[model samples]
Target: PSMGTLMGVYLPCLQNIFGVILFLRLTWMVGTAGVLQALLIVLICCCCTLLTAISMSAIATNGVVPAGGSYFMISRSLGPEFGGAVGLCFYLGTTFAAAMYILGAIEILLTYIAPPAAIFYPSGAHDTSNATLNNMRVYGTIFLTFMTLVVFVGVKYVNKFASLFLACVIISILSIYAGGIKSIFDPPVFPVCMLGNRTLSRDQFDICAKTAVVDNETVATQLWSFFCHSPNLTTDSCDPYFMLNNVTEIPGIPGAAAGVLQENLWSAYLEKGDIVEKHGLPSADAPSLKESLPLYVVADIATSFTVLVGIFFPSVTGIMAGSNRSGDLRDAQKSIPVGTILAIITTSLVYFSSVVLFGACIEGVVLRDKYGDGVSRNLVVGTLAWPSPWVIVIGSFFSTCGAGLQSLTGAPRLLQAIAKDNIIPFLRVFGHGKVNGEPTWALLLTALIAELGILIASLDMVAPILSMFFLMCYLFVNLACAVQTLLRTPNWRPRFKYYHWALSFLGMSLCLALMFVSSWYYALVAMLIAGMIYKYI
Candidate 1:
């Protein structure tokens, strides 16, 4: 389960999509209040991990994992009516995500080619006005065709291909991690000024001064004030509000003041300086050491969570699949409980290690900057720009792709199971087959639908909206898991029983909380779109 979900899908998703999220969060929170942001992220990750464990435990108990794990489980336990609804969400979400992954991969590939063409080709020679559209048409068509062929060839072939691709994915990821970790310890130098020492040269200062209408006395006074109190003169150039001010006249300088009030006004200047110094720098500009610590901690926590996603989701998939095949697999109820406990322990360790490593690196840099020659800041900046941070990047890419496959595989199988009960109309379309006695047609259909998602993502405006929808499905899946567990407790008994009521309640609450945290307008629009699909399909 860990291998399949974590290595295959979850890790990649975190490395790619969630990495972006972390970057955004870091950018937002780092500038304002790093510690608060870090705390919030930690809080969120802990809650999410616990909730996910509970939901997975509930799911493991009641359903049999066929090809599509969650889809199979949900449909079997909850009935097809709800199953199909959630199935649609699952299918669309996974498909959209898959499309995004493929499109991203293609775009990265194209970037390698497009620059050379632009440099060599005559203007408009390639007739590249619709280059993006053309590229998508070509890539999307090729990808869809290849996927269709794989689906037609059947799961065995597809599984083989997936295995090979997954191996490549793993190697690529490991390479990246190894490279990044190496670079972290022995980072190459990139030209970067220390954060506090960023300065404007004399010429630049003159240019700035020329633009201002300030009298020379005022300018002289201001320059002296800056020289006396500026904490880190290096960062003065980049300071947001640091601008040349035009004061027509000095406020209290007497006309009889000799030699530009150098000595006579010095005491007054110092007095004024005391007030200016007390106000201090803006929080966004000059962050306190205590405040910045949290950002590093939060980043570490988020990174660890990403790694856990890679490990847990896939392992769960495999475990669930195994359970479906082997009846009474070592007391299903007890096994699931033990498994959940183990998963929680393992997940916590992953999170803790990641946080420690990442945080240590960040803190080392911070400490070095504070005490050393301030080269550590430059090191941090350089490391971020390192070429093969792609380990995490590619890991994320594969993780998302694995997630897509997991969804495609699991969703259809579940839908087929529900259909077997005649809950959905095309029951014959997904009937038990002779070869493996599984619903092959359903799987094919699921793949096809996923292919369509890839095509839809080809459109730029639709991609962000689709992502929101995907998140919504995740939100719903948690809710469905919670609801199913609570409502059906009377009918079933499992070896591993949690505080079902509490777990279900927490699950619903967390899902809803995350749902709210998602972009409001985007969520509304996505929900509306889901409603339309629900009404029609």
Candidate 2:
């Protein structure tokens, strides 16, 4: 009388896995770290999740794991001392993830969607970053309220719509592949104006058009001809004018060109301000002017492969959604292993192909272009969509909305589970549930913590923080599996034959290495927080 693998385990994992980062930031990651490096990023992140899933499979198959998800497993196997620390830390991680999803949703809604979407734009505000962040915070609160209400109402509905969400994600993802593969055969014929590797704006487009030889190509006549012919061209960048057999050729990069992929095959990790403001050629000596800096200023931040890892890691963080529902599964032991492993494989392939697709199909400058505060925001993935770019925009928006709801639903359950364990004195208040044992109080608490994360506003800032938390939790899961296998306890015979102590140990080591490599300060802080929680418990 319980749920099966597809309904209870696989759907949740699949829906949870294909979220904010995939639609919102995957192209940016590919653009930042070329196709090959982006593949490496995907491989590393997916490996972490894959290893954790294997370890999770081992642990779940060892016995009939009960209601409290990862918390229950960790406490029973690794002793309450480690369990209590990770449980609370993991709960917070999940809560913050809800915030991340909400912020991601709001970001897409505000940045991508057409106007008539309600928001009071600030007057006399030249600081677009702050203005956008403020809108994010405001919209985040509104979205959080709706999500909280949904969770408060029931988990039943969440389960009901999980399949629909997964469908939306799968369709959008398939469309991306469809568009990219099609581009290889019939590459997009649109021109993307460039001024020394940078996509030119309207004024810059005009300037470039007048140059004797722009980017080593003589294009002054063609550019001016298009400028003169197309009077109603609304977009500032290269205009795709639909004329009656009179296509003006401008000297610009065409989509899916082999040369474009070559240019995008390696990393170009520049400062955020430089990237967003669309700074002039690399040789241009003009320092970027700033009236007011955005929150989490990137001027002091140096981008690297590890930094990209931190951003990309969150896409793979939902690996535990299958195991989280062990209580509802008809056969937790078998269902958890089959569903989680398959979801991991499916998502890994999608991500691997996407990194390559994006790199191959779009010009590097356009791909690297930021969704800035001006009229010329680049929709990298959207532009690559087959039927229309709006398909990606609308699909991603709903997709993120679904993910936010999923996060809100999952986080409260994890919190309630931790609270009910009675390991920490303060959490006892959240232990009580009503309406078919739903965690009402715990949901509220999760909402409050999620509010804190939403206020942080910037997706780039919050992603790395949550990445650290999930890594810590995954680190412990791997530790628990490796420890149990190494001890060879009498009850440690797992039905899952594909696991080994060395594999889990490697997973644990990789988590630790990534945590430090991504951000030493955050890694130290996460560890200190965990250690303190352990000591208190």
Candidate 3:
């Protein structure tokens, strides 16, 4: 169970997302300048990791947490009102995040299969217009049924399956990385001319002269020879004599021509002048065209992190399994702490390694043009170049399926925790089933609420709102860690002693810093929500 929860679910998820690593790369490229960007990324990631580790250590010392770990911790240590608010955020965040993951996966699969379906159907036999929508309905229904069964079969099966899936996910990432490495060493073959810098026409003066004459002729003809040209000048070519005479008749025509002639002559004399000054000189700033094996490794690592998030975050089955064992443990706090520590360590390693690998891979690809053949081609040419109109029809279906399953699984566990506290009305509905100790009624109720959430989430605007809510939970966790360390709270003591008070002080400060860095608005909103829940419930 520990292995499944830590390795299968958490590790893969962390490795795939490698959040800090991605943020570092993105910020460096878009926010910072050159070599300094890389250094800043490394420093920020290291600091964040250390801070997170310290915070997790404090949480771990308390023991095994409830199904909703941090939320449960906050409520028990702080107060019911505060805990409930955190619980709401945590529960909804996990559920919504799970849905997002599933939806993303579904979209990928739909895109893969949609084109084949369209091709299979004869143009006139089957209406091609709605084929994509039809395909989505078919695929969505299939995925939904599969996930629902997995949830229904119980946590043990889900854990086993998730473990297997995680293994496959890792192998897939490694395969892609390996391919990228091969590409770096053996770059794709292309014509030499294609690789060379583009030649630009440098005689701007001559072009300006020719274009200027054309423009002047048009204006002169419109003003003076309008009657002659307007009736029917159907000749394919303009008469050169007529154009020249028209230009010569202008009051300052000789001066203008002499100036133009001088400019042209001067431009010819300096034809080989510095290429940099030329408007169309070959772009020397174009990204390098060399491929390195290390770059492929980096890209592989980065993409793996993203994929892992989808696989692990939605597998809330692991959390449910842990909750199941909560009953057997003599002290929930102690056991849960051990698991939490293990999770943090496992997740951190996975995330860091994945990020480093991804950064390296992306660097390799960026260094060379040919290195972007497979993935880049697929991303750029396949998707962008040949975009299908009905693409979203299929995408929406898969997204809905993944979203529904994720919500159903996540919401129930949160509901179970909440019911245990006698927080919600009609406590009996959240009671455990006699046969399996499963909170069957609570699960059902949670599923119903999740379905409602799905309906709400169907609206495009809901995603950002949901994201804000989730961030709120993260803010609470950070603050909780800070307060615990500052007050020298026994339940939230770190395992390693270090400088005792100094470490505590640092931990508190770091937690506060992280909270601010994460999302101030969401934190404020969460606080307000907590206050409201406390007053009403």
Candidate 4:
């Protein structure tokens, strides 16, 4: 009695659209991985999400998937004890995720118009005196507060707007790729930065990486131009629109130029980590065709990889999305086996093509520079190319709805389920549904936590933690399926002939690996916190 497969399918799938990962962080993903590594990144994410789909397919086909969805399945399979832990983690993860979308929407929407003031960010620290920065904060707070209330208003109305969200997602995506084609047709002036001869110290390198940010100044300051600049491989292996010097600053990747240099750069640095040191560091630079490289050396490769996916994994976690609507789907079993799997295939293709499109079409420097700004718009500006991004704003706004919406939808039901058990004293407040079987207090609690989060982190700063949360929840989901199947529970009657304990285990492993590599700090913290909660239960 909830929703048909198409709308049901589309609603959950849209979880990724209009959010940071697509428009904001995607370029950063391309920046770190280059082309092939970027595909590798996409592949890794695809595997994780697809494995998850398989797990859900087996379980959903087995019987009526309930209000708690994954949490409900896990509780039945693993027992209430484990359910309590993942239940809360999933709740917080989805709730915090809402802020991530809302913040991202505020950021991208603002960036599209790019106010005269310094850009405001939800990040805890900034030194800009520009009124723009302050105004950005005002706008951010307003948007944050507004969306929080919006999710609380009701899911019925949110669900009603499904088709509108669907349109925005397609238009934004098609327009971006089209603009990508236009962007590459004509390259812009090469981007160049006057190397600040300042050799900074080792400690300075991790400045942002140290403050909960993994990439820090390393990404901001490094010159990607070095990667493909000299090969002049744009026209072909030997193509050129300009000389290595005729080019001003390093523009975006010069078409094929990057491919030619990827190997050469690795060899150059492999032979010599002799890249110049930061101005304040013990070593430093030379230019005008000097043999010495820039002061910034590549940060830890593993860390860089982790950061890319950390920013990326959340975008893919929407596989549970169709399942998250456990309460709303008209037919959970039919919906999961068909809609979720197809949705996964559809999105994986989009992301895979996108990485290829941007790599081959957009320049490398644009990804590096606009990794934060809307890279699509940056490419457009490079072409000197708008309402299109506003369409993205709508897509983002819809993405905003569900992080909190799902939490509001999934969390309270789980809480109410747990409360009905009387396992936790006073935890019963969230265990009851008020209207439309809604869990009023549970939503209230989630929103309260969200407002605090919107206050603490920058609009841009929420990636690693949300990455950790969603992955951890998924790890449990897969583990639940694995444990149940391996035990060969006699009652199990999954219509999913494709089911296997091994696939579920593999899914669990992927989720855990992605989690740890993304951020050991958040992973360990999430594990410990969930474990502690389990201990109390």
TM-score of model 4 relative to the true fold?
0.71
Tens-digit per-residue lDDT, 151-186, candidate 1: 445667555554444454445434533533654456
Measured over all alpha carbons after superposition, the RMSD of each candidate to the real structure, in angstroms, is 14.4, 7.1, 16.0, 10.8
Where does candidate 4 have its weakest 10-residue lDDT segment? 263-272
TM-score of every candidate:
0.54, 0.83, 0.52, 0.71
The alpha-carbon lDDT assigned to residue 130 of candidate 2 equals 67
For residues 167-231, what per-residue lDDT tens digits would candidate 2 score against the true structure? 88888877887887787666554454433323334322333333256488654444444433433
Compare the candidates by lDDT and give the number of the best one.
2
Cα lDDT, all candidates = 0.41, 0.72, 0.38, 0.57
Question: Residue 35's C-alpha lDDT in candidate 4?
Answer: 69
lDDT of 3: 0.38
Q: Output the TM-score of candidate 1.
A: 0.54
Q: Which stretches of candidate 3 lie over 4 Å from their true place?
A: 1-53, 63-82, 116-146, 153-156, 188-410, 426-428, 432-434, 444-470, 484-537
Query: For residues 5-46, what per-residue lDDT tens digits would candidate 4 score against the true structure?
Result: 876765566544334577666654565466677788789977
- The residue-level lDDT of candidate 1 at 342 comes to 55
TM-score of candidate 3 on Cα atoms, chains taken together: 0.52
Please say which candidate is ahead in TM-score: 1 or 2.
Answer: 2
Clashing pairs in 2: none
Model 3 C-alpha lDDT per residue in residues 1-537, reported as the tens digit of each score: 233444433453333232211211231121112223333334443443344434444554554444433446556666575567667666666555444444344434544434344322435532432554344445444544466556766556554443443343444434434533443444232111111122112111112111233544532223222212332344423333233322111111111122322222211011111111212123334332121111111221212221222222222112212333443445554554445445545544544443333333332122121112223222211111112312322333333343455455656667676777786656646756536655577555544443444433222223344445443544455566666667666765455442244443454454344334434565466558668976996
